[PDB]
């Protein structure tokens, strides 16, 4: 994992080896099903590595981002308490992109999958709504608002 | 005013270290809280020390 994350950091920095990034991300997500696995994954500072460069991708690629979000959600589901801190950190970083994914569902299959992943991450985080509103008070509130909006959007798109 | 040793490093003391995370925590908090702050002095100073927010001319605090 040390050399791996060093590589991934380099890669996202230069924005290369997309297939490599995605495959490694999938391998990580598969390892993350395990308690000890995700435990070491955090112990690797997977956040400390990925969170910073991941801005570059938005500043396959969206597939890699989605897989990363999936790994984050699964990691929360695996070790909520000790990982909520880093989860909130990354979210505060990836907040704008999560909002964009939740909003794109109006205007596309890729928008759909991105919204689904952002929503799954938000769900995994919801189990700690206390600390969520505690640290990021604007976040949880704007989240509930837009979530009502998007549930309505889904209902309207589906009914007709 | 371990934050004191950190600042003594920042201003005067060179203070190289072993496997330390430096300027990572500054920029993160800065973008987390400082960037939105109304205090042009505080924001500009954080920008200077943390060497981020490149486009921030902070002109409200610098006019010449």
Automatic annotation (TrEMBL), chain A:
It is found in: Nucleus, Nuclear pore complex. Belongs to the Nup188 family. This is Nucleoporin NUP188.
